[PDB]
Design a protein around this ligand. Structure first.
Ligand SMILES: NC(=O)c1ccc[n+]([C@@H]2O[C@H](COP(=O)([O-])OP(=O)(O)OC[C@H]3O[C@@H](n4cnc5c(N)ncnc54)[C@H](O)[C@@H]3O)[C@@H](O)[C@H]2O)c1
Ligand SMILES: NC(=O)c1ccc[n+]([C@@H]2O[C@H](COP(=O)([O-])OP(=O)(O)OC[C@H]3O[C@@H](n4cnc5c(N)ncnc54)[C@H](O)[C@@H]3O)[C@@H](O)[C@H]2O)c1
Ligand SMILES: NC(=O)c1ccc[n+]([C@@H]2O[C@H](COP(=O)([O-])OP(=O)(O)OC[C@H]3O[C@@H](n4cnc5c(N)ncnc54)[C@H](O)[C@@H]3O)[C@@H](O)[C@H]2O)c1
Ligand SMILES: NC(=O)c1ccc[n+]([C@@H]2O[C@H](COP(=O)([O-])OP(=O)(O)OC[C@H]3O[C@@H](n4cnc5c(N)ncnc54)[C@H](O)[C@@H]3O)[C@@H](O)[C@H]2O)c1
Ligand SMILES: OC[C@@H](O)[C@@H](O)CO
Ligand SMILES: OC[C@@H](O)[C@@H](O)CO
Ligand SMILES: OC[C@@H](O)[C@@H](O)CO
Ligand SMILES: OC[C@@H](O)[C@@H](O)CO
Ligand code: NA
Ligand code: NA
Lengths: 332, 331, 331, 332
């Protein structure tokens, strides 16, 4: 229809559902989340501390949540291979659990009867696509794909614009990133990421990230030319990339602005935004762009050495791109 | 007294810090099946709320080491298997939250510990609050509970007020710092839906049995108190707001005089007293159970008054755990 | 009704947003001697708490412009000089906090406005709270106050409870979001020492006259209520925790039934009612004065109960300012 | 003695006083702050939301605050030229108001009878000094000096070490900075810095900063080679610099670490620190270093292009350097 099902009803799953319910040609057929019951699901969907109450009627019955009359079947399988995606006629299963992110594990949705899978996270084996960057490379024989990460969606469109116009010799990126669900409210155990265990709302927390390197997977011409790191900070949503790049061709910051603005208003419209206003992170809450270039924050030291700044609602911008990729794959 | 700690969360770690500075307490062992020794040493050394441990912290294959004291570590999901017998543990301190009843805390005694202190309220293990009813501890009790941080804040003040003026009944609210059970962004919390909501961006109502539990350590107030909590985004330090109906007419100055005499007297180091313009961060690291805030309280009529008392919900309480350990060893 | 706003802080700006969506209100003018027009347009368009204005905002040499409506701006430290007469202003809305008494608010009438609404409690100007005593407004009153956000939250609930069960007396606490008077890091606040302390890292006790002021809009409760506040790090939305002694024995279900009937009936849009597992962020942008939280409240005995009600201290109150403006114009 | 007086009893003034009271050869003779009375001053000094209660007895009498027996005279002049610095025999007035930061205005303390002035902020006209970087350039004929800013104190010692060993061709810096007193608790007026007016604890807030350029004033060899920007975030204290540098000589990240560690343990001891642990910002609360290199957070993309990370308690590290500069100037 395209008919979709959502696996995992966390931050991304619930917002992907909000957005999908608003797309006329997307039908949300079901959701699966083993960690929450049907009445609880309707509560989590209705109330949102970051993005406000759902603007629509939410209720539930025995086996569904109901949103403005649309019934969405719920399930609670830990193992997605046991889901009824075949008899529910699911075209695309959207996996937002962060747990079935490889070809051999996302394959479980296709085994369960879905025709294709979109993974809402970077993958080492599933081909990655970023709207505005390489979605045109998608072909219909690929049944399992990745939408990369929020940070890669922010960085890649900007990197493409800059590379096309001036050439990126190399670049180092920092993202100052809002806190996320993997973090802890007070110092607790996080054996895979020790800094990530520390009180989230009372610290600046360095973290490694593969997001800048992954740009090289969606733009092969930048393979090996980008890397970066992150600092997690106490804001609840919205993040910003700070990309320090060495350019091949001398340029002025004024020319950089005009090229980004022209791409924002042209071919990357709705993906890359542009502003000259005195913005701060909360001004992008609910913003559906992948990347909003902040022209006034950036700074140029020399004709080929510049620091560029771009904002992103890491929850809402990314969830919109997920639904965009779903619809692209369905029309292709 | 030789102790072992089960659980190495906020309470387990701070109890360890405090225990290492008490000359009559020897920390023999720590159990936490989550963490490895290197990570345990890290979690112990660095603390976002109470600062770096001021001593040398290291580790080896079988221990974490603090200023030369080797602390043996184990990783037993089931405390029954722990080497308490062969470690000559006198008291097992269980800070996991999981073995908080007589029949589960027994696993430490089966493992050879002589006694157990549970760092949480219990339905079945007798509760004690220092300055309130630790006198009632008798040496035949092998398993006991130190109640909760909120009960330790409310009970000493309630005793003082009840003994002097009579509490007919009272409704309490605690404005409480966020806790480890909360979530950084709205996530699943099936037993406490409000508690799943973004911790640092909400005021979050919660139920609490702390006021009711005062009735267990002060039987004369059974049925006379109840209350509720609001969890807010500060990282530590909480405050009780107790609204009481009194049996005897009083003035707020007489209330202040009585609480201060108690803080300076029999409840010294448990109940504190201030008239200064304090805010929550002024009690970070404070070892009192309850610090009465004289200037914040307000009396509407001779038998109806709102009393306010602060507590470092981590540090005050962890200090009382070690106090109760020593009392149970000297008794 | 043609209105002018004095002051362009949190209340001034939100009153402007709400007023621009009321078809019977025309915003003629704004005064704030701090800001220039370009900056006024920016402060109006972007809002960290309530989002971007959903309309086009621009400015020129003498105006800020919102979806084609030109709003004349002035910069007069002394409202006496403002062109209210020659702007045919019916009601001057003073949100500065500075001209909150009869003899100072008079400056707007001297400048030619017909009437004034002061968006703060006043010692001398009569106070009105919608759903509580706006019926008592008489058209000869030129200068009136809309009380405070906390009074607007407490008074409608107190009226409902008092009318049904009788309030003998009550002590209130509000857990209140931080406000513009607070400081980002410990700094000078000579009139309110606790209020100078780092806003986002403390629970901060504060005094409030809001409960006492209920006695001004409901004379039958004069002397029967008082209370205090704790300011905490959330950016907006507050909650009242009202502990009342009742005249008539009741059950908590009868209390719920009465408040719900009122919320669905005569107090619709002023007092709301919920049983859901809400937290503060669920009322961001809510236009009610008071949302009774049925599941958070707790009854200890038949005449002693704790009632809980939420309020968006910016948005609910700004909505009531515009309601009172229109009521005073239709009266 | 050296005898000092403090002008301005804000974050820096109060912490400079805590530290000075602990230095045996520094005598704190007086403080001036027109915006607060004597009993209030004693309260602000005793209680601190960030750095805890003063460990010592604090009281007051009519005209002094008293700390562990030491009486410190208080004053309330808006115009520092009216202070009794001559009859109080003040050797060094420390101006921490952020308001008397030029030669011609700091001069007021010398007119009032102080022999020298140390300004606790960057200055356009007073010569700037950073301990560990160029304090040796101080000569006794200079009566009015600046200790630069906290960010410059963090960046300059690291920049010196890196430049000496590998040569800095150019560098772009970001500081992720804790909130400060100039910021607002909820959106309010800040006509000189519009982004700076926005709710401080609910936003990431870009800001311009001259701190990276100012490194060129204390290290002339780096004049024109550095610039940067800042993001203010909701933590209450402790900041971190993220310095992206182009090097003249190829190197490995491993060699960079060994050079920084050797400087931290040698000539820059107590100014530049070094760690390999999984630290987060709150681990540096109360830390007296200007700069603590975070070896595990940094990342190198190529042999001459690296991102380095260094922490600083912007309040406490800087206030310690103020007292250090005061004592250097007194012994010189
Ligand atoms: N939140 C962001 O800023 C953001 C941005 C871009 C990408 N992502 C990616 O999206 C994915 C989800 O992130 P999130 O922030 O929504 O996390 P989340 O914790 O908010 O949601 C994860 C959800 O999956 C559910 N779940 C866990 N195991 C499951 C299983 N076995 N079957 C079905 N459901 C299961 C959990 O109950 C939880 O509700 C992650 O991979 C994350 O990296 C997140
Ligand atoms: N922190 C407070 O404000 C506070 C105050 C007083 C009492 N308490 C009580 O103390 C208990 C712990 O609270 P906390 O804040 O320390 O939680 P926490 O998350 O900080 O610590 C709990 C720790 O126990 C460990 N653990 C879990 N299961 C275990 C098991 N099977 N065996 C050994 N270790 C295990 C976990 O890894 C975790 O680190 C709770 O019952 C709580 O009610 C908490
Ligand atoms: N914000 C709330 O939660 C809340 C709720 C209800 C009522 N109120 C009341 O409304 C009043 C304003 O509060 P706020 O939060 O809007 O403060 P605010 O700081 O956000 O706004 C006050 C504004 O008034 C302007 N101003 C100051 N003096 C002026 C004058 N001479 N002439 C014109 N403008 C002037 C200032 O520039 C400032 O921007 C206070 O009295 C407060 O008690 C506040
Ligand atoms: N806080 C930091 O992280 C930090 C770090 C490095 C440098 N600095 C610099 O130190 C200076 C002070 O910063 P702060 O953070 O202490 O600010 P603050 O607001 O905390 O302190 C400034 C104090 O000066 C007082 N004051 C204002 N005018 C005065 C005058 N006329 N005479 C006497 N006192 C006056 C104010 O009452 C206030 O208490 C600023 O220039 C700042 O840039 C601050
Ligand atoms: O289950 C329906 C939903 O709208 C919420 O009321 C929360 O329980
Ligand atoms: O200084 C000791 C510290 O490095 C360890 O405890 C954790 O890494
Ligand atoms: O979009 C309008 C906005 O730019 C101004 O109101 C402030 O800069
Ligand atoms: O004025 C003395 C000081 O120690 C504090 O008690 C706060 O008033
Ligand atoms: Na010991
Ligand atoms: Na209108």
């Amino acid at each position: 229809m395209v008919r979709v099902a959502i696996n995992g009803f966390g931050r991304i799953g619930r917002l992907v559902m909000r957005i999908a319910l608003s797309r006329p040609n997307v039908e949300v057929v079901a959701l699966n989340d083993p960690f929450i019951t049907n009445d609880y699901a309707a509560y989590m969907f209705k109330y949102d501390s970051t993005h406000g109450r759902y603007a629509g009627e939410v209720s539930h019955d025995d086996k569904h949540i109901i949103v403005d009359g649309k019934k969405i079947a719920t399930y609670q399988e830990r193992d997605p291979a046991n889901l009824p995606w075949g008899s529910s006629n699911v075209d695309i299963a959207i996996d937002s659990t962060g747990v079935f992110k490889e070809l051999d594990t996302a394959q479980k949705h296709i085994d369960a009867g879905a025709k294709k899978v979109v993974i809402t996270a970077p993958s080492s084996t599933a081909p990655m696509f970023v709207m505005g960057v390489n979605e045109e490379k998608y072909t219909s024989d690929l049944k399992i794909v990745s939408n990369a990460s929020c940070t890669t969606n922010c960085l890649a469109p900007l990197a493409k614009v800059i590379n096309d116009a001036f050439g990126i010799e190399e670049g180092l990126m920092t993202t100052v990133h809002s806190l996320t669900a993997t973090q802890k409210t007070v110092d607790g155990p996080s054996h895979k990421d020790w800094r990530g265990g520390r009180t989230a709302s009372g610290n600046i927390i360095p973290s490694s990230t593969g997001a800048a390197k992954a740009v090289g997977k969606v733009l092969p011409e930048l393979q090996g030319k980008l890397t970066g790191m992150a600092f997690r900070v106490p804001t609840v949503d919205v993040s910003v990339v700070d990309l320090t790049v060495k350019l091949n061709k001398e340029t002025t910051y004024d020319e950089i602005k005009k090229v980004v603005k022209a791409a924002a208003e042209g071919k990357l419209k709705g993906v890359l935004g542009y502003t000259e206003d005195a913005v701060v992170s909360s001004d992008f809450l609910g913003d559906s762009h992948s990347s909003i270039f902040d022209a006034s924050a950036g700074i140029q030291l020399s004709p080929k050495f510049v620091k560029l700044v771009s904002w992103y609602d890491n929850e809402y911008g990314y969830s919109t791109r997920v639904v965009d990729l779903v619809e692209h794959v369905a029309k292709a």
